[PDB]
Every structure is written in C-alpha cells, then in structure tokens.
Design a protein around this ligand. Sequence first.
Ligand SMILES: CCNc1cc2oc3c/c(=[NH+]\CC)c(C)cc-3c(-c3ccccc3C(=O)OCC)c2cc1C
Ligand SMILES: CCNc1cc2oc3c/c(=[NH+]\CC)c(C)cc-3c(-c3ccccc3C(=O)OCC)c2cc1C
Ligand SMILES: Nc1ncnc2c1ncn2[C@@H]1O[C@H](COP(=O)(O)OP(=O)(O)OP(=O)(O)O)[C@@H](O)[C@H]1O
Ligand SMILES: Nc1ncnc2c1ncn2[C@@H]1O[C@H](COP(=O)(O)OP(=O)(O)OP(=O)(O)O)[C@@H](O)[C@H]1O
Ligand SMILES: [Mg+2]
Ligand SMILES: [Mg+2]
Lengths: 572, 569
Amino acid sequence: KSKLKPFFALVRRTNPSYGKLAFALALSVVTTLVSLLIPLLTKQLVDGFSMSNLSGTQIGLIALVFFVQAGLSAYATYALNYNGQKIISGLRELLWKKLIKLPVSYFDTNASGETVSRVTNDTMVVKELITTHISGFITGIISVIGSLTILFIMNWKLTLLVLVVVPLAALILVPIGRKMFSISRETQDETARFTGLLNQILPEIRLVKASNAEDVEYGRGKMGISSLFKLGVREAKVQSLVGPLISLVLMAALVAVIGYGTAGALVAFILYLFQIIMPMGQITTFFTQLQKSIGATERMIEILAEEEEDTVTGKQIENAHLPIQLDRVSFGYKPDQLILKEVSAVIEAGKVTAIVGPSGGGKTTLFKLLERFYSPTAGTIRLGDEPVDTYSLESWREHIGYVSQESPLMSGTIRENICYGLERDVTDAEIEKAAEMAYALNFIKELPNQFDTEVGERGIMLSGGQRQRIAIARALLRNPSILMLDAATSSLDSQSEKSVQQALEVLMEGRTTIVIAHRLSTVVDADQLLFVEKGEITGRGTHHELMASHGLYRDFAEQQLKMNADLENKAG
Amino acid sequence: KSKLKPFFALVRRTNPSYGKLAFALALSVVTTLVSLLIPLLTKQLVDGFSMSNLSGTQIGLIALVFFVQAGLSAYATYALNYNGQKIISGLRELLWKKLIKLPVSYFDTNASGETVSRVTNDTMVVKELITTHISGFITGIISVIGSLTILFIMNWKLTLLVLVVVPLAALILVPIGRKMFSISRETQDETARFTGLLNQILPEIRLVKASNAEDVEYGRGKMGISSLFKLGVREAKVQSLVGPLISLVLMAALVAVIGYGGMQALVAFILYLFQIIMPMGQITTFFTQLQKSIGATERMIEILAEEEEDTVTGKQIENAHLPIQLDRVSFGYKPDQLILKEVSAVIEAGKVTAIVGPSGGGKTTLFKLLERFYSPTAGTIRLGDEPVDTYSLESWREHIGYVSQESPLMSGTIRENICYGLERDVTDAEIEKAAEMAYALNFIKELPNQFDTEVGERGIMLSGGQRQRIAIARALLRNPSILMLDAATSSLDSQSEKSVQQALEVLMEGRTTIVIAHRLSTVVDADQLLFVEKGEITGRGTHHELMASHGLYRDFAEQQLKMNADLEN
Ligand SMILES: CCNc1cc2oc3c/c(=[NH+]\CC)c(C)cc-3c(-c3ccccc3C(=O)OCC)c2cc1C
Ligand SMILES: CCNc1cc2oc3c/c(=[NH+]\CC)c(C)cc-3c(-c3ccccc3C(=O)OCC)c2cc1C
Ligand SMILES: Nc1ncnc2c1ncn2[C@@H]1O[C@H](COP(=O)(O)OP(=O)(O)OP(=O)(O)O)[C@@H](O)[C@H]1O
Ligand SMILES: Nc1ncnc2c1ncn2[C@@H]1O[C@H](COP(=O)(O)OP(=O)(O)OP(=O)(O)O)[C@@H](O)[C@H]1O
Ligand SMILES: [Mg+2]
Ligand SMILES: [Mg+2]
C-alpha cells in the first residue's frame, strides 16, 4: 500500500545481499573523508614545499602510496557492482522458479510470450540503480552532513535556513516522482507487449509470408515501437526537468541568506554554501531512479503471490492401482460459461477405452483435467473410491504419460527430447525400444547419427510424419500404468498405425489406456466407447452394441463408412 | 576490418541523428566554457560582493537568473537523450524490416527464439553510450586541450611532459578495450541464448509438466543464469581496472616534473595538473564503453548483410493462368544432402490433383518448394513452359492459398486471423461466406461474438479441431488461383470433411487444387493421384488405373481397405 515496502522486502529475499554492501559503502565512506580533506591540506602542504626537493621525494612516495588508496575507491565500486550483479542474479532465479510452478490456468490468460521479458528486461532496469546511484546517495548524505557541520554559524546560530532547503525541494520532487512512477510502469509494461509481439509472430514466418503479411506485420512492429518507445521520451522530458527545479529551491536558500544578514562571517559563509550543489544533484537523482525502479518491479511483485499449484503434499498413498471414475463432475474453462455437463463414467482398468467426439465437444479438456491441471468446480475425480487430490498434486502425474492434440517438441536434440521424464536412469540401451515401439527407429537410423540429429525451434528439422511419432515415444518410454494417446492419426501413415497398434497392445494389457481418435475406425475394438456431445455423453457400451442397441446418432459411424464404401466398387 | 568504421556506418543508415545533435553539442560546448570561467569570476565577484548588501542584492539577483540559465544545460541533456532515443529507435526500425524480408532458409539453420532478443536487449546498451558519456567525450576533450594550453610556458619550451600523459595511457588502454570488446560479444550472445531458451519453454508449459521437468528445466534456467550472468561480472572486474592503470600513467607524469623540470609558476603548475584528473577519467570511460557497445553491435551488423530475398524485381504480375509443371526437379534441404530425386510431374490445371505418400516422404517439402520458399538447386519449376522465377518472387504467393501441416495462428481475434488476405478491404459482408465454405460459422456464432473472441498464443483458446478449420478459412478467403490443402483430415471430424469437400467443389471448378491427404479414401476421385517415396515419384494417372496397372504396392490402398472393412462385420 506504500509502493515502497514490498520492494525492499523483495530484494531482502535474496539473502546474500547483506554480505558486502555495508562493507562496500564503508570503504566508500572513508573515500569521502579523504576527498573532503585533501583540498584543505594541499594549500598548507604546498606552503611546506618552499624547497620541495628533499621532502618532495618522500611526499612523492607518499602521494604515490596515497593515490593508490585513492584508486582503492574502484575496489568499492567493483564490490558495489558485484553485490548488485548478485541481487539481479537471485532476483532472476527466484522469479524463474516461481514462473513455472504456478497453475496452467494462469497461462491461459496472461499470454506467456509477453511474460518472458519480465525476466530479462524487468530486472535489468534495477541494475543501473543498484550500482551507481546508490554510491551517489551514500557519497551525498555524508557530504551534506559533512557540509553544515563546518557551517557552525549556520547549524547553531543561524539555523532557520538550513531546514528550509529540504522540505521545499522534496515538495517539488514528489509530483516528479509520481509522474515518473507512472512512466516506468508503462515502459516495462510495453516492452513485454513488444517482445511478446515478436515471439507470437517471428517463429511463425512460414505463415507471415502470405504475400501481404510482411507489409502488415512490418506495420504492427513499427506502430509497436515508434508510437510507444520513442514516446518514452516522456520519461526523458521529466528526467531533465529536475535540473532547474532542484536549482530553484537552492536559489530560494540564497534569497533567505541575504534577507537575514556579521559582515566578516557571511563572506566565507557564502563560499561554504556554494559547496552543497553537487551533493544535492546526486541525492535528487537517487529518488528519481528509485521510484523509476519500482515501476519496473510493480508488475513483477504480483506474480510472486500466485498459488504454486504443484506441491509435494502426497499424504500417504501413491501406488495402489485401481480404476478411475468421474462422479457428476463438470468443469469450466471460464468460471461462468462452463463447457462440460456433469460427466459420469467409469474407466475399467486392464481394458482400453476410447472417447470419440465431433469437433466442438469436450474431448480435450477431459484429458486436461484428468491430469489435474484444473481441479474442476462441480463434481470430483476418484480412483479406488478415494479422492485423487489426496494422492498428490503433481507427483501423481509421473505415473501417467501424455500427448496433446498437437505433438510439441523442444529445441534440444532428439535425445534430450525423450529423456527428462525419468531424468535419472535414461538407460541408453532402452531408448531404442521405445523408438521401436513408436515405429521411430526405421526412419531415424537413416538420419545422421540420431544423438547428433537436431530439431529446429518447434521441430521444423523433423517433419510432421516424424514429429507425431517421436512425441509418443515420450509416453511409451516413461513406462506408465495410465496412458493417453491423443491423436493416433494426426500426422502419420497407416503403415505407422498398424505397427503402433500392434506394438502398444503388447505392453498395455494390465495397464489401462485412454485414447481418442479422429476417425472411429482406429479404436472400434476397445472394451468401451464414450460419445461426448457438447459436454454430455449419450452413449456407452461396446461399439458393436452401440450400433444396434442405441440409436441417438446411428450414423456418426455411418458417416465414416459411406466415405470408405467407394473403395470397393472402383477397385473390384 | 577495423571493427569501428561499420559502427559509424550502422548509425549513419539511421538518418535523423545528425539533425539536432550539433545544437546539442554546441550547448555542451558553451556549458564547458561557462564551467571554465565560473571560478575566475567568483573569486573576484566576492571582492565586489564584499560591499554591503545594498549593492550585492542588485548583482545577486542577476547571478540568480544566471544560475537558471546555468540550468539550461539540463535541456541539453534532454537533447542528447532525445537524439539518443531517436538513434536507438532507428536501429530497431531498420533491424526489424530487414528481419522479415530475408529468405526463410535463414530462419531454420539459425533459431528464431535466439534472434528475437537482438531487437530489444541488443540496442538498449547503445543508449547508455549515446546519452551521457558522449557529452563527457566532448566536455573532456575541450577541457584537456584548454587546460594544457593554459601551461603557456610548458607547451612551447618544456613540452616533454605533455607528450607522455595521453599516449602512454592509450598504450595501457589497448588491452582493456580488447578484453572489454570480447566480453560484449559474449554477454550479448548469451542474453540472446537466455531469452531464446525461455520463449521455447513457457509456451509449451503443458509438456514441461512431465512431473519431473519442473525440477530439471528449472535447473537449465539456473545453469543458464548463474553460471553465465553472475559470471558476467567478469567485465565489472576489468571495468574497475581502468582506475589503477590510469593512475600509474599520470603519476609517471607526476615524477616527470622533477625528471626534467627540476632545473627551472612551479606551484601553479602543480595546481593545474591536479585538475586534468576528472576530464581524463571521463574521456577514458567513454573509450571503455565504446568497446563495450561495439561488441554488443558487431553481431548486430551481420544480420543487416543478408540477401533480403523478397523484392518486386519480378517484372510480371501473373494475370494469366496455365498449368503447373515440374521439370526434372531435385531439391536438397542442405547443399550437400538432398531429399528429392529428379522428380517429373505435370499439375493439370482447373481440375483437382493430389499427392499421397508415406510418413517422412517428400510430400510437404514439395509444397514448400512449389511455394518457392527455396528455389531448388537443380532442375526448374515452370508453368505454361515459362519458369516461375522470371515472374516475381512473392507476388505469385498472393494467388496461392496455403494451410500448413500444423495449424498456425497469429495471436489476436479470429476475425483478424483471416482479415489480412487482401489486407485492405476485408469487406465484413462475406467473411462468413468464407467461413461457410469452411464449415466454421455453425461452430462460431454460438461463441461470444466472433470478432470479440480472441485466440491465445498458438490458438490455445480454441480447439485443435477448431484451429484447423479456422486456418482453412484464410485459404478460401483469398479466392486464389491455386489452392493448397495440406492436412484435410488432421484435426476435424466426418461431419466436417463432408460439408468441407462438398463446399470446395462448387467454388473450384475451373480453379486447380493441389491437396495431400492421409487416408486415401478422401482423394479417390481426383483426376491424378501421385505417389511419392523417399524423394522419388512412382505413380501417375487415376487411382483406379494406378491400382492394378502399376506394381509397386497393390496393397497401399488395401492398407486401409482391410482396416476399414471391419466396421460392417
Ligand atoms: C544551487 C544553484 N547553483 C548552482 C547549480 C548548478 O546546478 C548544476 C546542475 C547540473 N546538473 C546535475 C544533474 C550540472 C551539470 C551543473 C550545475 C552547475 C554548473 C553549471 C555550469 C558550470 C558549472 C556548474 C557547477 O556546478 O560548478 C559551480 C562552480 C550549477 C552551478 C551552480 C552555481
Ligand atoms: C591518476 C591517479 N589519480 C587520481 C585518480 C582518480 O581516479 C578517479 C577515478 C574515478 N572514476 C572515473 C570513472 C573517480 C570517480 C574519481 C577518481 C579520483 C578521485 C577519487 C576520490 C576523490 C576525488 C577524486 C578526484 O578525481 O579528485 C582529485 C582532486 C581520482 C583521484 C586521483 C588523484
Ligand atoms: N480455452 C479453451 N480451452 C479448451 N477448450 C475450450 C476453450 N474455449 C472453448 N473450449 C471448448 O472446449 C473444447 C475443447 O476441445 P477438444 O480438446 O475437445 O479438442 P479435440 O479433442 O481435438 O476435439 P475437436 O475436434 O473438438 O477439436 C472445444 O470444443 C471448445 O469448444
Ligand atoms: N527442416 C526440414 N525441412 C525439410 N526436411 C527435413 C527438415 N528436417 C528434417 N527433414 C527430413 O526431411 C524429410 C522430409 O520430410 P517432409 O517434411 O517432406 O515430411 P512430410 O512430407 O511432412 O511427411 P508427412 O506428410 O508424412 O508428415 C524427413 O524425413 C526429415 O527426416
Ligand atoms: Mg485434447
Ligand atoms: Mg508433410
């Protein structure tokens, strides 16, 4: 509620920040003393240089030694940079850990491509403050406190004026700080929009070559930068405005000194007064960057309070395998326009069961919440007549492989694209078997040295036929007791399909499998078939039973068979 | 070659920097002069100010307004910073335009996730050079020359001590910049690496949920951060080193005062030489930062030197329409290894043709080739016995729709996902007409306000089945000369494809259509069925003729025939 307390609270979280900063400033503290004492002794010392020949060698040696300790100020600067280059490091560390552990429902709203720049750019702004200006603040406060002390006429007898410089200046600065804080909160919250705009586009250049997108996309980029970032000059305008105003209040000090004038002391008093300008320049800049840095962090703190969906809180049960049943459970991908309708069905183990649905139904999310991304609102999910949430929050997941409507990959090689599931016992001799069981070997060995082979960003180097096949190798290698194929027909030929169907049947006899297929033909043989329509289910039983006994559609399957019926008369 | 001329050349291509910068420096010039003359007047003004306040007030108020005019130097800093804010915006502008128009080939060998950061974090460093220290480089250079010229006996009779202060310091700085320059190319090429890692991790979070990746992939971020950027402190090490080294060179001049000046005012000499300290330090920092900026921009320049392939240099607009022909085509995705073998086929116009093949064949590469993304090394691609290359590079694309094997979508409103075909005259009246021929509105109008609804990053908000249709609308809206359905059955049901196929038949009757579809049942009735395999073509003609006449498979169709025949029994 103060725009200040959370900041110093957040930097405190990086524990090693206490190690050297106080030591760093203290080294700079003595640097201030020698600087504030050198000019008052050189005039006396040069008077002692009336001969400057025999003693000059010793003082020259002394000056040699002393000016090395003048160079010692850099060691404070190096340390000050060092501790700063740590407080940024842990800040990235602590954020990045928190940026994955939070529920996927958060990412379905906040445009992940935008929030990436809140790791790089929304911390680099702190760097300029933490290193240089802080030294200015320390070197200034000691200088100003070391200024009025010699003003003994001014700090014990003529004090009515030293106390008027700060309240006026700060009163002037407060609007400036508030304005600039309203700037930094934007310049960061548009960098994220800008850097986000690219990764939503640039990795997809294949489409943006639509023969006119390049014109339009170039338009969006420019309107992103020029109309916003160059208009960030608004920060520059207020940043330069401080000079006059910080000189203005100081001017008022001077009208006060001439209005309360005795004669033999004021002459030196004016000279002493003309020393505090440079400290005032540094101190005013510190607060300017201070409330600047906050706006570069105001967005960051909020993503440090989202509720960490994953826990290790698996109470006492992880392993005993029992069927999975959903009891009157309904879910909303949006908290009001619920898209599902109190599904109730049972998944008997040891027997594969298939969901088939027309495009627009509730197939995908029924997987996406059966892996407990969402914890649906109405109803619940059980296995073994026990609540699933009592098993774990995501330690349950490792017993379950998964592929998506798509087949995503990551920029590593084809090796560490399959490994990180078990991530301890890769068992190089077994990566082969999983690729075999996904029919991946026989069209990989021809590639240049599988381990050496490299995908593009989204797996452009591999292809659609190869992309889907390599994805399920992740699921079959993880050795699960619960499996989800998601598109056995996405991008792969019938040649691939028969081998895959002939392969995973050999493993998954006592390990329950739930698969959804684009075409009804691939999973007719399964021991149970659901038929999801717009969040409801209006069919059960085996497909052969479903045809004759049940008659809601009676033609969804027949909408497939008349497609293939042309293949008999025209062929023989 | 010299690694400094291109920088002033790279800045040069952004024109407007030269406009107001001279006025900015000129203000800094008079800023230096007034700072040069301020101490001389005050030490004698106080003698005049020694008079009572009756005369002091009349002069003090004039000194006050002088101070406000001394405050005018602030608006000089704004001028530099604005000029700086102009040059950084220009660098982003030029870089962004060159980034789009390069051949797609570069965006595969390189990584898009890497190059994104080179527009945000690889120009911001140039700000800190161009804002403050550029003034220091000017303030120092005038002050040092002015201060040296004050030594009017030392510059014409005892010049030995002025030829050592600067050149010896420069000799010391030579390794410092060289070490610093090597740092910037490393730190910037790793910030690029770090930002590259994240944009290919977060968007696919649903698969980093492998129940152990949250521990492992988090480690990759740390190992990227901690072992590199907390070790990026290594430049802060040498950046401190300027202090001690500028010390020895100048004290070496301090001992030179007795090395040659001990035989000859002298006290005024010592006073003045203790004033060149801050200017020399200020100007020294500028060179150090310069070698820092040059490194963070030496990788920057290189991607301004690619072929910027797309042009309008094709002196044709494609008014006519003739069939597509492939003449002895052989393409390789790498100049050494090739996946296409002398393929020869004629795409008959105005009547649908198809390509069917197995996984990992040459199907979709032949699409990217026929869109002329790559211009194959061997053979040629022509239409009507005229090469495609003479026509244009990407005005031809405007006549050909293209839906990909995956279902791509930019982020925005699903309206805006289809709008930019004509990019000017969206003509709201018949967007639904494109959707109806794509079977979309029956599963769109029920949603909240077709325009209002917005997809996520890769269409996460809509479904995969929905996305593949919503992409195919972009194909039909362009009303193209050539239609390219790449995945007609990827993610969509039987209730879709029947309504889909029945729609395109009316639309394209004299407009040729190239389609590749799995599950051969869906392309049985096309005029020409082509078989591709490992970069070679081994089939022609109608499906019924190719069935028994050719003898390669005789069972590839039977592949699904026996797979689908089980439903009846
Ligand atoms: C309180 C009112 N008194 C003054 C306030 C001043 O404010 C200044 C603010 C500045 N901006 C800071 C961001 C800079 C750069 C120089 C300033 C000077 C200045 C300007 C030109 C030449 C020399 C000096 C100077 O400081 O030397 C005086 C001997 C300055 C001088 C006086 C007397
Ligand atoms: C060549 C060796 N001789 C010197 C080198 C120096 O290097 C300095 C480098 C600096 N870094 C630049 C980025 C800064 C900030 C101050 C420096 C001072 C300095 C430090 C504290 C107080 C006053 C001064 C100072 O300069 O005033 C001397 C009267 C300094 C002084 C001397 C004598
Ligand atoms: N943000 C959202 N996330 C998931 N589903 C959504 C969202 N918004 C709406 N939906 C609805 O939820 C359904 C989820 O799609 P689903 O996972 O079933 O796709 P699918 O399994 O590939 O099948 P389809 O062929 O219908 O795409 C869609 O039909 C869609 O209408
Ligand atoms: N970036 C790439 N571009 C082209 N080919 C690649 C690339 N990376 C790898 N390849 C290799 O080139 C071959 C051709 O793949 P292609 O993209 O033609 O498959 P496809 O036509 O998508 O197959 P399917 O249609 O069955 O998915 C692949 O077997 C693959 O091994
Ligand atoms: Mg799904
Ligand atoms: Mg393909």
